[PDB]
Amino acid sequence: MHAVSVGKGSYATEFPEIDFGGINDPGFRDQQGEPPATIYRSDRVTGPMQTNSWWGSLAVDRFSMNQYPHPFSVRHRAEGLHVFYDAPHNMVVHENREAGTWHIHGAIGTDFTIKHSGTANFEQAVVDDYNDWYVRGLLENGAHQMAITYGVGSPYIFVEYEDGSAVLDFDIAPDVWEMNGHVIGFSTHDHKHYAAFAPPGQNWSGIGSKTLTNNADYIAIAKLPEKDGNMLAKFEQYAYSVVRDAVADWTYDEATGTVTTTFEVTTEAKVQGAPDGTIFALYPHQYRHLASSSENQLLQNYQYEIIRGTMIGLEGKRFTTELTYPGVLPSLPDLGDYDRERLIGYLHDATSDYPTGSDTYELGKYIGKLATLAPIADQMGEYELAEQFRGELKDILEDWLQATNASGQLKGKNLFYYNENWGTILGYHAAHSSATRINDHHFHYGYFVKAAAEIARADQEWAKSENWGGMIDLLIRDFMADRDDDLFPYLRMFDPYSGNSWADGLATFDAGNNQESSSEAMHAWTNVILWAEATGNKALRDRAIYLYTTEMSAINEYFFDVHQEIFPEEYGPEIVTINWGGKMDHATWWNSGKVEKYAINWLPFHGGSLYLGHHPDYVDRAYEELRRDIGSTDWNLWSNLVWMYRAFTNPDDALQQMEASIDDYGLFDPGNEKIIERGSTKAQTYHWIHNLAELGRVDPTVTANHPIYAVFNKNGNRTYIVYNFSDSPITVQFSDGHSIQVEPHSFNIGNG
Numbered sequence: 201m202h203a204v205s206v207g208k209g210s211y212a213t214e215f216p217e218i219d220f221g222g223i224n225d226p227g228f229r230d231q232q233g234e235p236p237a238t239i240y241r242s243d244r245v246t247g248p249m250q251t252n253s254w255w256g257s258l259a260v261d262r263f264s265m266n267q268y269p270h271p272f273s274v275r276h277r278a279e280g281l282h283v284f285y286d287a288p289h290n291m292v293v294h295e296n297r298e299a300g301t302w303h304i305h306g307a308i309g310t311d312f313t314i315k316h317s318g319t320a321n322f323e324q325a326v327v328d329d330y331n332d333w334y335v336r337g338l339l340e341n342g343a344h345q346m347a348i349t350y351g352v353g354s355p356y357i358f359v360e361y362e363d364g365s366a367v368l369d370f371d372i373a374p375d376v377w378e379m380n381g382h383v384i385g386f387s388t389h390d391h392k393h394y395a396a397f398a399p400p401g402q403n404w405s406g407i408g409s410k411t412l413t414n415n416a417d418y419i420a421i422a423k424l425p426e427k428d429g430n431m432l433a434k435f436e437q438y439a440y441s442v443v444r445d446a447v448a449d450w451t452y453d454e455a456t457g458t459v460t461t462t463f464e465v466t467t468e469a470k471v472q473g474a475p476d477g478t479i480f481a482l483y484p485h486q487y488r489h490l491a492s493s494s495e496n497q498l499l500q501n502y503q504y505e506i507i508r509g510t511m512i513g514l515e516g517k518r519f520t521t522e523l524t525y526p527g528v529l530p531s532l533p534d535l536g537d538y539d540r541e542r543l544i545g546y547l548h549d550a551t552s553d554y555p556t557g558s559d560t561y562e563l564g565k566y567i568g569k570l571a572t573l574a575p576i577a578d579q580m581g582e583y584e585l586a587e588q589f590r591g592e593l594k595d596i597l598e599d600w601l602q603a604t605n606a607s608g609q610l611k612g613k614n615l616f617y618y619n620e621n622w623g624t625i626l627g628y629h630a631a632h633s634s635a636t637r638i639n640d641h642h643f644h645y646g647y648f649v650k651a652a653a654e655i656a657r658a659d660q661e662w663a664k665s666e667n668w669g670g671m672i673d674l675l676i677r678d679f680m681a682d683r684d685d686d687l688f689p690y691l692r693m694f695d696p697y698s699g700n701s702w703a704d705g706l707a708t709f710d711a712g713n714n715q716e717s718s719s720e721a722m723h724a725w726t727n728v729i730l731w732a733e734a735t736g737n738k739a740l741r742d743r744a745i746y747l748y749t750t751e752m753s754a755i756n757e758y759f760f761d762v763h764q765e766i767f768p769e770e771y772g773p774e775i776v777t778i779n780w781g782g783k784m785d786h787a788t789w790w791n792s793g794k795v796e797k798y799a800i801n802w803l804p805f806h807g808g809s810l811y812l813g814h815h816p817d818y819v820d821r822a823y824e825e826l827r828r829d830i831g832s833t834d835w836n837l838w839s840n841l842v843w844m845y846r847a848f849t850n851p852d853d854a855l856q857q858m859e860a861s862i863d864d865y866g867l868f869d870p871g872n873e874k875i876i877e878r879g880s881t882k883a884q885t886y887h888w889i890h891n892l893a894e895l896g897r898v899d900p901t902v903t904a905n906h907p908i909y910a911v912f913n914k915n916g917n918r919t920y921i922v923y924n925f926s927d928s929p930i931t932v933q934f935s936d937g938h939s940i941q942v943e944p945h946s947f948n949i950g951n952g
């Protein structure tokens with residue numbers, strides 16, 4: 201028919217006739233559509249299509265747009281594949297001073313072009329295969345084909361020809377500084393070092409000219425870290441080992457909190473005896489966390505400078521990283537020294553709030569706000585109020601998770617639809633190109649999961665598969681599915697090697713893909729942990745823990761640069777707002793002021809936000825730079841978010857600021873976000889800051905054998921917080937020796 205039943209809910213299988221609610225705005229109306237009809241993929245690539253990847257423009261554009269398989273940038277064109285490396289003289293830091301924006305980026309250049317000897321112009325470039333982080337692009341022209349295999353973290357580009365041979369074309373003649381017949385080392389006229397490898401017996405010609413040629417039907421290109429014969433020889437050892445498979449496998453240790461990820465390639469040999477291995481180029485978030493047994497394969501002097509700092513080479517079939525999952529909570533407990541009747545008052549005030557739009561995002565922000573208040577209402581003994589908040593969440597979700605009306609016809613808004621062409625669940629009304637570009641599904645659907653996790657915490661019946669849980673589990677599968685999911689691609693949002701989520705479904709930019717709100721990604725992963733725990737789904741929980749923890753490790757390098765090794769000295773801000781494959785911006789997608797270019801990577805605040813306080817020196821440095829640029833603590837917007845962030849290191853200051861201004865906000869005022877950001881409340885703000893004043897600093901040096909906890913430390917006095925979703929009492933062991941018993945369906949708090 202028109203819809204598929206999933207428990208008590210349903211999703212549409214036919215595109216609905218949208219009810220626009222009388223809005224003429226061309227923007228809003230254009231959001232209510234589908235992603236592109238044409239997918240540039242070969243007949244070998246079948247089933248739900250992978251999206252939100254560093255390589256996506258190859259699947260969407262007839263050729264490709266500019267891509268960043270670090271350390272390279274590349275792009276597909278009719279004439280062949282252009283290859284480029286951003287050297288220091290290509291890199292700039294640009295500024296719009298009056299806008300207060302900053303931009304770190306390079307050039308869209310060409311060092312050379314990989315061509316096919318028999319074809320001046322290919323008709324298109326398609327995705328021919330892909331794995332966890334490499335892609336195979338296929339340039340095609342009847343019998344003539346050129347298949348290029350490349351990847352983030354790969355300093356090789358492997359090229360396979362059909363009915364033709366290899367040509368490397370240069371605008372200016374390169375210096376060929378090592379000619380070993382079938383292997384050459386060369387430099388561009390502007391001193392960038394590369395190597396090309398053909399099979400033994402197939403020699404290079406055109407030395408001294410603008411065009412190097414080889415009769416072989418296979419070559420590899422390598423970016424060399426230095427002009428150096430020893431490196432050239434090392435690269436030669438693995439140049440005939442073409443990557444066919446690449447897998448990021450992970451485990452979560454329930455006793456230690458350790459997330460262990462093993463990155464493994466499988467290669468096919470192009471010459472006899474070629475080893476099963478490659479040379480990886482590791483990003484900072486990987487080599488900073490390399491397992492002991494992987495340190496021996498690291499090539500310390502094989503470095504590449506890229507937008508994300510220094511990459512370091514590592515040789516072999518596999519390497520392993522080890523991270524520490526720090527725990528999450530469903531909310532903060534009742535431990536602050538707030539005026540309780542004042543907080544109760546703020547909870548009543550919040551009934552006045554309403555969604556500021558009909559789309560999945562604004563509705564998400566609203567339900568996140570309700571889900572945040574319910575546990576605070578419980579803690580304050582306002583059980584009527586808490587039930588009213590959870591009642592409204594049910595009502596909103598039972599509507600949105602049902603595609604059909606009473607008579608079985610499709611609704612025209614507040615529903616989900618399965619786009620079969622790509623293989624994705626789309627929500628209408630849509631915004632931020634969630635439907636048209638398959639953008640931001642974790643950001644949006646994360647709030648729906650937040651709502652469902654809070655309901656599930658209190659009402660297991662509602663959350664059962666046959667009830668409303670099935671539809672919730674479907675939205676989750678859309679943005680973070682496991683392997684071999686019939687409807688969706690694996691881990692849609694996440695790039696396991698780059699270590700972060702990519703927000704754009706199509707990636708059709710010359711800076712590659714991008715991510716703005718890393719905090720909204722972490723919010724999605726947090727809420728899936730909570731939901732999985734509330735509904736008894738260990739596999740789902742552990743996958744969300746792996747995502748949470750890996751994303752954390754990348755936020756600390758590329759958004760915050762906590763170790764001060766990534767951002768160039770002349771970049772003024774203490775944060776990057778938007779990370780792209782090939783660039784970094786201090787800027788927002790909408791017209792914003794100063795605070796927002798920081799705080800969009802803090803919000804929303806919730807029980808998984810404590811990762812933001814792991815590096816107190818960074819938190820002080822970032823706040824101070826924002827304060828200096830503002831010129832005071834008169835925040836241009838979102839004051840409450842700045843107060844809550846400041847509370848991670850100076851809760852006295854946070855409190856003083858809050859007391860001075862919080863009660864200049866009355867009831868919900870959608871048009872004024874100066875004091876309270878519209879996805880937040882006074883109650884949340886007051887509860888958060890007072891709790892942190894009592895608890896002290898987040899303490900990441902203590903782990904536990906349970907996933908739902910937090911440890912705080914206030915001048916040597918630790919507080920231990922645990923929540924038990926199970927109907928069995930548990931004992932939780934902390935790594936410092938502390939122990940606590942927690943009853944079914946509740947918090948417990950200990951001190952030491």
Ligand SMILES: OC[C@H]1O[C@@H](O[C@@H]2[C@@H](O)[C@H](O[C@@H]3[C@@H](O)[C@@H](O)O[C@H](CO)[C@H]3O)O[C@H](CO)[C@H]2O)[C@H](O)[C@@H](O)[C@@H]1O
Nearest residue numbers: 561565631632640643644716717720789790800873879
């Ligand atoms: O305050 C009025 C002002 O608010 C703006 O709303 C912004 C959102 O635009 C912003 O969207 C983010 C996206 O850029 C993105 O990173 O992914 C999600 C959405 O999919 C968001 O993080 O989010 C912030 C915080 O929620 C909002 O304040 C309006 O865009 C703007 O027109 C309006 O004038």
Ligand SMILES: OC[C@H]1O[C@@H](O[C@@H]2[C@@H](O)[C@@H](O)O[C@H](CO)[C@H]2O)[C@H](O)[C@@H](O)[C@@H]1O
Nearest residue numbers: 632633637639640703704705714716789
């Ligand atoms: O790229 C993902 C990002 O897209 C933003 O919208 C932009 C839009 O503002 C404009 O520039 O057009 C492009 C497509 O050409 C859109 O991608 C979304 O606002 C943002 O939420 C999303 O993460």
